[PDB]
Amino acid sequence: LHVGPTTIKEDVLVAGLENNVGFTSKEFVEALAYSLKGLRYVMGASKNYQPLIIPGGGTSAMESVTSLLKPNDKILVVSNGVFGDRWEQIFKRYPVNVKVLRPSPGDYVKPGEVEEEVRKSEYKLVALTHVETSTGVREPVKDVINKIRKYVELIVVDGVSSVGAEEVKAEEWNVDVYLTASQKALGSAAGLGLLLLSPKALSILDSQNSIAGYYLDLRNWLPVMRGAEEGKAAYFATPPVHVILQLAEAFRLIEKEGIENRIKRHTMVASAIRAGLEALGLEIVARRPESYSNTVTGVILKVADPQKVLAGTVNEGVEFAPGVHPAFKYFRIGHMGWVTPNDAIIAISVIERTLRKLGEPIRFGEGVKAVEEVLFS
């Protein structure tokens, strides 16, 4: 159970075995069109919102937002950790003005604090992170946007670790760019960044110049996306053909389960794992319980070394992820994509026996029952 689930459904991987398929083939065009619709479905938007699928991943999707910007534009980044900070690292490469709001480690920036800033100063674009993967902290995006919508021209949300697992309502919340990647809660193969654009965002692409480069200017990919939905092949640059076939199959499986059911499963599994961690007497990295993400949980270690924990759990049946925040000593549990109640049982079981052998103060024999209790309901 890692950041970037390493286990992909077999149906999804097998979908990439289709041969004699290139970017002009009707099989590809159909898979692209289907994925584009699937993006609207998981982000909750009507045909008024424009999906785009581009090469790379969450980072190339984030940088592609420069397609909506002009020199000297003012940007406010609301950063809860590493991947909030990535917006700033990206925008440092561009002729734009950036201000960043940050909270105390492992906490989150309150809607009122964002409201105060956007009311004081004029901002073209506000960047949010739905789930900050470094800390497992979920920002209350609906509440933030409710406060700020009328003060700012554009709102972008990095949903790389939220889309397909947390409630996302891109149209209803009036988001201008909601973006994700193929390999996280969508549970498909890596190599694609995914974006959903509002009418207002689309009008910028269609009517204005921008500070974008070439490969990541969303204007260059738009004819390919519009084309696909009209059943037409187009060429800008060669896309990851087989990765997109795999993506269409992931979306077929997501629609089959149903997005509401998928969200509920993530909520149940995450609450169950958290229950187990608490019953073990382990502390969660996320400071505020209302922001406990349903995809990532950081697990503070008071005595044991997190590397030893990572090495010891793999030889016991589960792979987790390391902690990457100077303020905490921790490891992370990724619980996203196709994660099941049974995975929750195994994760806590493995955590218990690994921490036992490494001398972390825990309450033995309590983890799994706590998990079972939640799943029992």
Place this chain on the structure above:
Amino acid sequence: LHVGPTTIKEDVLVAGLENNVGFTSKEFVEALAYSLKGLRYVMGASKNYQPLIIPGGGTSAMESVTSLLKPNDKILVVSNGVFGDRWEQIFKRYPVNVKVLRPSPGDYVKPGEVEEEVRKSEYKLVALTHVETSTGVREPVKDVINKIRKYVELIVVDGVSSVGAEEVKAEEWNVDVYLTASQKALGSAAGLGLLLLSPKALSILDSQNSIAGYYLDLRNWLPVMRGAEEGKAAYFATPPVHVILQLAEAFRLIEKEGIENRIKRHTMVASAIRAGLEALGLEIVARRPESYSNTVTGVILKVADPQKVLAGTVNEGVEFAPGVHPAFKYFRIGHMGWVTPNDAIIAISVIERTLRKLGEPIRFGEGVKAVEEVLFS
């Protein structure tokens, strides 16, 4: 037989079925390290030259060359067609000065003509296209560089349609960036750009700032590549994990065949197809025979409509590519990757019976024997 072979060896595709693999997994690191070595092998360079594998394709690799540039730098593009012109389209997005040399349609810029230009004006960077896919014309890279090396700081070669099929000697010819993509003559799945950098190029990355963006700044990927070759996992941004597994398998097959043998096979197959076209009384797009590429041949049609030819060949057993040059009426044959002598026989057979039904003036009964004659030796 299309631009971007649509048929991928089964061994290569199957390699992408490996599950429970992420960017930190030893299986991935090993596949990345192996592909990096494979790049040195097919481009003919010692360990002094630094390989990098990045997301996207030939276009993202091309744009990543901005990592070596500074504002107001002077660039000379030697463009024989569409993909030479792409260098200009990319560089239009950056604060650089660009001059383009072009030849007559279907011709190529002679080493002496590039020499004259680089002596008259001082250029930081010269961009070449090894094989121009739009016309099937191969630029004499060695000869060009022999003339210009002493007059220019940096030389980059787009080998997207040459690497793994044409002789490439990146170190011996003293190229600073030689680049390609995963899906052309390497015959692997799409989604990766590949670069090989000289020590001089590497010193620029290590010691200077640049005009690059974020995702395509080669400085950001360098720690991941150096890491891999030391057997260490690193993270900049998530790479196309399974596409890279497929790439390592392609490289295993290429080393098994041997690169010299692979080049010889392309030479034989291409000469055979050309012999068959000539014997049919068909004219090749490439104006100068010394530049007939071994990966792409353009086929001029005097009477028949190229679209009809494309539609008619697919329902006869082969898919070709359309012509994309305002100066010619033609279709293209892609003959690269895993192409065999038998594919050459089939291609000419299919061309003969398709052109017959469409009223193109040809010499019937002569194509296949001409092909067989060349293979005969």
